[PDB]
Enzyme design. Structure first.
Site, PDB file in Angstrom:
ATOM      1  N   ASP A 234       9.215  -8.609  12.962  1.00 34.33           N
ATOM      2  CA  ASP A 234       9.976  -9.754  13.473  1.00 34.33           C
ATOM      3  C   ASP A 234       9.965 -10.532  11.847  1.00 34.33           C
ATOM      4  OD1 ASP A 234       8.435 -11.493  13.506  1.00 34.33           O
ATOM      5  OD2 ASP A 234       8.146 -10.998  16.223  1.00 34.33           O
TER       6      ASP A 234
ATOM      7  N   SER B 287       0.107  -1.023  -0.371  1.00 28.94           N
ATOM      8  CA  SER B 287      -0.369   0.166   0.015  1.00 28.94           C
ATOM      9  C   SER B 287       1.018   1.388  -0.295  1.00 28.94           C
ATOM     10  CB  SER B 287      -0.811   0.409   1.646  1.00 28.94           C
ATOM     11  OG  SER B 287      -1.660  -1.275   0.969  1.00 28.94           O
TER      12      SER B 287
ATOM     13  N   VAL C 167       4.244  -8.272  18.052  1.00 32.54           N
ATOM     14  CA  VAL C 167       4.556  -9.229  18.442  1.00 32.54           C
ATOM     15  C   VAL C 167       4.927 -10.321  18.953  1.00 32.54           C
ATOM     16  CG1 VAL C 167       2.742 -11.332  17.688  1.00 32.54           C
ATOM     17  CG2 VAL C 167       1.673 -10.058  16.312  1.00 32.54           C
ATOM     18  N   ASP C 168       5.036 -10.804  19.763  1.00 35.60           N
ATOM     19  CA  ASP C 168       6.117 -11.531  20.287  1.00 35.60           C
ATOM     20  C   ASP C 168       5.852 -12.902  20.573  1.00 35.60           C
ATOM     21  OD1 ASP C 168       7.934  -9.289  19.897  1.00 35.60           O
ATOM     22  OD2 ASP C 168       7.924  -8.825  22.648  1.00 35.60           O
TER      23      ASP C 168
ATOM     24  N   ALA D 244      -0.603  -0.481   6.001  1.00 34.11           N
ATOM     25  CA  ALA D 244      -0.391  -0.763   6.909  1.00 34.11           C
ATOM     26  C   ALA D 244       0.841  -0.601   7.438  1.00 34.11           C
ATOM     27  CB  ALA D 244      -0.438  -2.427   6.588  1.00 34.11           C
TER      28      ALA D 244
ATOM     29  N   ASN E  40       4.629   1.253   2.427  1.00 29.71           N
ATOM     30  CA  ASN E  40       5.099  -0.178   3.964  1.00 29.71           C
ATOM     31  C   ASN E  40       6.081   0.377   3.990  1.00 29.71           C
ATOM     32  OD1 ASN E  40       3.014  -1.315   1.943  1.00 29.71           O
ATOM     33  ND2 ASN E  40       2.263  -1.244   4.070  1.00 29.71           N
TER      34      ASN E  40
ATOM     35  N   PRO F  31      14.132  -8.699  20.232  1.00 26.53           N
ATOM     36  CA  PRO F  31      12.195  -8.384  19.723  1.00 26.53           C
ATOM     37  C   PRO F  31      11.871  -9.650  18.399  1.00 26.53           C
ATOM     38  CG  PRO F  31      12.855  -6.876  19.040  1.00 26.53           C
ATOM     39  CD  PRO F  31      14.075  -7.101  20.536  1.00 26.53           C
TER      40      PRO F  31
ATOM     41  N   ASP G 234       6.474  -4.391  14.964  1.00 28.61           N
ATOM     42  CA  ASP G 234       6.566  -5.728  16.314  1.00 28.61           C
ATOM     43  C   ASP G 234       6.040  -5.702  16.753  1.00 28.61           C
ATOM     44  OD1 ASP G 234       6.861  -7.677  17.127  1.00 28.61           O
ATOM     45  OD2 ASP G 234       8.815  -7.538  16.373  1.00 28.61           O
TER      46      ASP G 234
HETATM   47  C1  LIG Z   1       4.386  -7.218   3.352  1.00 31.18           C
HETATM   48  C2  LIG Z   1       2.721  -7.330   2.797  1.00 31.18           C
HETATM   49  C3  LIG Z   1       2.480  -8.554   2.336  1.00 31.18           C
HETATM   50  C4  LIG Z   1       2.853  -6.155   0.892  1.00 31.18           C
HETATM   51  C5  LIG Z   1       4.235  -6.451   0.523  1.00 31.18           C
HETATM   52  O1  LIG Z   1       4.501  -5.104   1.614  1.00 31.18           O
HETATM   53  O2  LIG Z   1       5.059  -6.709  -0.076  1.00 31.18           O
HETATM   54  N1  LIG Z   1       2.392  -5.294   1.840  1.00 31.18           N
HETATM   55  C6  LIG Z   1       1.242  -4.365   1.255  1.00 31.18           C
HETATM   56  O3  LIG Z   1       0.576  -3.205   0.366  1.00 31.18           O
HETATM   57  C7  LIG Z   1       1.262  -4.019   2.807  1.00 31.18           C
HETATM   58  N2  LIG Z   1      -0.692  -4.205   3.035  1.00 31.18           N
HETATM   59  C8  LIG Z   1      -0.691  -3.034   3.427  1.00 31.18           C
HETATM   60  O4  LIG Z   1      -0.784  -2.051   3.461  1.00 31.18           O
HETATM   61  C9  LIG Z   1      -2.539  -3.836   3.667  1.00 31.18           C
HETATM   62  C10 LIG Z   1      -3.424  -2.142   4.151  1.00 31.18           C
HETATM   63  C11 LIG Z   1      -3.660  -2.408   5.286  1.00 31.18           C
HETATM   64  C12 LIG Z   1      -4.597  -1.341   6.145  1.00 31.18           C
HETATM   65  C13 LIG Z   1      -4.161  -0.406   5.953  1.00 31.18           C
HETATM   66  C14 LIG Z   1      -4.144   0.285   4.338  1.00 31.18           C
HETATM   67  C15 LIG Z   1      -3.266  -0.695   3.422  1.00 31.18           C
HETATM   68  C16 LIG Z   1       1.900  -4.444   3.258  1.00 31.18           C
HETATM   69  S1  LIG Z   1       1.224  -7.150   3.205  1.00 31.18           S
HETATM   70  O5  LIG Z   1       0.169  -6.414   2.595  1.00 31.18           O
HETATM   71 CA   LIG Z   2       8.434  -9.833  18.022  1.00 28.07          CA
END
Ligand SMILES: CC1(C)[C@H](C(=O)O)N2C(=O)[C@@H](NC(=O)Cc3ccccc3)[C@H]2[S@H]1O
Ligand SMILES: [Ca+2]
EC number: 3.5.1.11
Lengths: 207, 557
Positions: free
Chosen positions: B252, B1, B75-76, B69, B241, B205, B73
């Site tokens: 992690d 995203s 979650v542990d 997204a 991201n 972590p 981290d």
């Molecule tokens: C790690 C992933 C498998 C993939 C990647 O980075 O290769 N990403 C996304 O699109 C990003 N996904 C999102 O950002 C989805 C999202 C979640 C909440 C609010 C808006 C967008 C990450 S995960 O999918």
């Molecule tokens: Ca962790």
């Protein structure tokens, strides 16, 4: 007036809800969702609570067990029970709205039941607040905020120490799965701020 | 995203522009749902995943919001100490404590039901147990107990009219999610939201912690520690991201890294190109980043260095010249099946070979396969989500940077050989592989383009539609499942906010019993493919002026 909900759809079918209190606003939203996406939502519900095998068969058992194993439903229900009346009205209005349309669907299925129900051989049941909460938990929290590979990481670290020795093995782990890397491009520029915490990077929890 | 928020000092003909591309994979009916809510303190328009009560993407005429997204981290795993003398118990703070447990029955269509038990400790649900070592692993989430609060935070934030009201709700959202803000005055902001644990000193972590009590989290960190910025001096907020902030640690997950090689740099390059961006330019970043090979920028310099003393007739050199002439933007030929340039296939074969000779060879089996992927791995349905730089490629990037990299190369991935020798050998493999498939005339190579599929099974792999409702688009585009843009105080309109989105295939998923699809079942499919967009209305007059139908209900609670 307190009872009135006006639903307007635009030229792409997007619905606009007009209402005068929280429950009625969310009822209108639930209602339009049940009109537009009932089968998707029903299947989302089953996905998020691990009740797919019930309609689709043996190929989804492991899936359903895996979903149920990753949450504690009574905890979700306890959070819902703790809501103030205004917060509860969001989830209850929404479930109540879907239910009003679901009830119309099951009353005249010959014209209103989404074709997919006939195809997959079942009919839609009503919704509660918990179900609305669980759509969000299962498709947001669990999809995007529940990621860990620590057990696999430890397996990797053990294999690296077996191949290179304890010290070099830990240093190779730090080369493949660095804690932080200062050259990472950051959304917040370093002139603005930096994160003030420093983390152990040698598995000192078991040292 | 991805997301790019352009503030007052960077926007042209507007005070702020927000462009969001949440990448959730592509589904039919649409992953998100368009909705406007008016009354009871709300006045909002936008779209949101699975029709949550809270719109993740939208605006309220004063402020706008979006997300990506976070991947912090949060979650542990705790390794619980068990005892064969006391089944169902675990050692915690010097006592044997009973696990919680519940029975569940899976009912099965045309089959036999199955019952199993779920167990839970003070640290979370148990994932797996090792009777051999009398250890059970429990998954601890920082957001445990705040799921419902997070849903409500995403709803109440829609009523915020300024940064402080909005951040008050951002502080209540407990999942690891990047949240973004823009407003009519041109203010912009970002918060890496969520709950993060305050770990004991010495807790790495990335690896499990003993569950016996000494390694328990102290509590949760305060909101003040979440990464955030309001009106950054750069004039923009860009995220794909990537890391939120200097020294902030990532998830992690072994396949997830924040390093020198990051796809967010493709957005920065476009944002920094011109002093200011108009709303049309900001939208056009979607099309460019959608088509951008992510590895060309990272590895072209290494390839150019390795082939710099080669003769013109050397094929290792001719592959790199082809890449040098390319900007990395893929475009379809007229057949709608193949890419105009062969560079992604050249980089894919080269990178696969490189990773096999370097990172893969350094890592013991079977963990070596975590590092062998090139980033180009698909399905004939095309990628299930975004494309990214693979973990192996990010690690190779650090190695090829030499002492420009801040990561100690504890193991030389080139194993004592000159980097040039390995780069060239990989180029020799690439020429052999591609020339055998396509012949020796590079200029006529018609390499396969990736396609895009709106899947009838949801992300869980569960039908959400019949298989024939799957929809296909010739051009894979590394972009949001939906795209939305909000423009604040445009100088070209008197309206305080203008906003658009695209929700394909359409708003409705309804098919009547006789097979008749709704009128809004597929009317946004073409618009999606061509980088078009529709207006999001907010005001009563705009909604009324574009009204197709209306219903009035009279309901008593
Ligand atoms: C790690 C992933 C498998 C993939 C990647 O980075 O290769 N990403 C996304 O699109 C990003 N996904 C999102 O950002 C989805 C999202 C979640 C909440 C609010 C808006 C967008 C990450 S995960 O999918
Ligand atoms: Ca962790």
């Amino acid at each position: 007036s307190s009872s009135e909900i006006k639903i307007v759809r635009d030229e792409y079918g997007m619905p606009h809800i007009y209402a005068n209190d929280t429950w009625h606003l969310f009822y209108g939203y639930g209602y339009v969702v049940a009109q537009d996406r009932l089968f998707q939502m029903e299947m989302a519900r089953r996905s998020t609570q691990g009740t797919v095998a019930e309609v689709l068969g043996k190929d989804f058992v492991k899936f359903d067990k895996d979903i149920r194993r990753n949450y504690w439903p009574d905890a979700i229900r306890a959070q819902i029970a703790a809501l103030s009346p205004e917060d509860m009205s969001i989830l209850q209005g929404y479930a109540d709205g879907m239910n009003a349309w679901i009830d119309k669907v099951n009353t005249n299925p010959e014209t209103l039941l989404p074709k997919q129900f006939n195809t997959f051989g079942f009919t839609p049941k009503r919704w509660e607040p918990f179900d609305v909460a669980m759509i969000f938990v299962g498709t947001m929290a669990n999809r995007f905020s529940d990621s860990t590979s620590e057990i696999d990481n430890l397996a990797l670290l053990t294999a690296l120490k077996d191949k290179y020795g304890v010290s070099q093995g830990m240093a190779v782990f730090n080369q493949l799965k660095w804690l932080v890397n200062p050259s990472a491009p950051t959304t917040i520029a370093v002139q603005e701020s930096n994160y003030p915490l420093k983390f152990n990077q040698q598995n000192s929890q078991t040292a | 995203s991805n997301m790019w928020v352009i503030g007052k000092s960077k926007a042209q003909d507007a005070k702020a522009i927000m462009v969001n591309g949440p990448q959730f994979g592509w589904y039919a009916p649409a992953y998100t749902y368009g909705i406007g809510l008016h009354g009871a303190g709300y006045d909002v328009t936008g779209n949101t995943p699975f029709a949550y009560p809270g719109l993740v993407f939208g605006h309220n005429g004063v402020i706008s919001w979006g997300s990506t997204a976070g991947f912090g981290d949060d979650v542990d795993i705790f390794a619980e100490r068990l005892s064969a003398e006391k089944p169902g118990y675990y050692l915690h703070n010097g006592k044997w404590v009973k696990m919680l447990s519940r029975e569940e029955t899976i009912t099965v269509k045309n089959g036999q039901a199955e019952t199993f038990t779920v167990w839970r400790t003070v640290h979370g649900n148990i994932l797996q147990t090792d009777q051999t070592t009398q250890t059970a692993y429990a998954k601890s989430r920082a957001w445990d107990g705040k799921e419902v609060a997070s849903l409500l935070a995403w709803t109440h934030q829609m009523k915020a009219k300024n940064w402080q009201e909005w951040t008050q709700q951002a502080a209540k959202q407990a999942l690891t999610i990047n949240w973004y803000y823009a407003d009519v005055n041109g203010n912009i902001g970002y918060v890496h939201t969520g709950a993060y644990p305050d770990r004991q000193s010495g807790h790495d972590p990335r690896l499990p912690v003993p569950g016996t009590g000494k390694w328990d989290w102290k509590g949760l960190l305060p909101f003040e520690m979440n990464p955030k910025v309001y009106n950054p001096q750069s004039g923009y907020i860009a995220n794909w991201n990537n890391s939120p902030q200097k020294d902030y640690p990532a998830s992690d997950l072994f396949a997830f890294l924040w390093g020198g090689a990051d796809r967010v740099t493709e957005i920065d390059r476009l944002l920094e190109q011109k002093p200011r961006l108009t709303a049309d330019q900001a939208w056009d970043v979607i099309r460019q980043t959608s088509r951008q090979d992510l590895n060309l920028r990272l590895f072209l310099p290494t390839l150019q260095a390795a082939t710099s003393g080669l003769t013109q007739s050397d094929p290792r050199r001719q592959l790199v010249e082809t890449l040098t002439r390319w900007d990395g933007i893929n475009l379809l030929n007229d057949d709608g099946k193949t890419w105009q340039q062969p560079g992604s296939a050249i980089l894919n074969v080269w990178l696969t070979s490189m990773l096999k000779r370097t990172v893969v060879a350094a890592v013991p089996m079977p963990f070596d396969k975590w590092y062998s992927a090139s980033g180009y791995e698909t399905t004939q349905d095309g990628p299930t989500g975004s494309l990214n730089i693979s973990v192996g490629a990010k690690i190779l990037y650090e190695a090829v940077q030499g002492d420009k990299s801040p990561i100690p190369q504890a193991v030389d991935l080139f194993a004592g050989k000159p980097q040039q020798e390995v780069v060239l050998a990989a180029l020799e493999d690439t020429w052999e592989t591609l020339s055998k498939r396509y012949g020796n005339n590079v200029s006529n190579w018609k390499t396969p383009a990736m396609a895009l599929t709106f899947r009838a099974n949801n992300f869980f792999g569960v039908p959400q539609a019949a298989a024939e409702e799957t929809r296909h688009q010739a051009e894979y585009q590394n972009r949001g499942t939906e795209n939305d843009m909000i423009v604040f105080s445009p100088t070209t309109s008197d309206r305080p906010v203008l906003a658009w989105d695209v929700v394909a295939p359409g708003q409705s998923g309804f098919i009547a019993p006789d097979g008749t699809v709704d009128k809004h079942y597929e009317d946004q499919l073409k618009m999606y493919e061509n980088f078009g967009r529709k207006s999001l209305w907010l005001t009563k007059q705009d909604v009324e002026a574009h009204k197709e139908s209306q219903e009035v209900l009279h309901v008593q609670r």
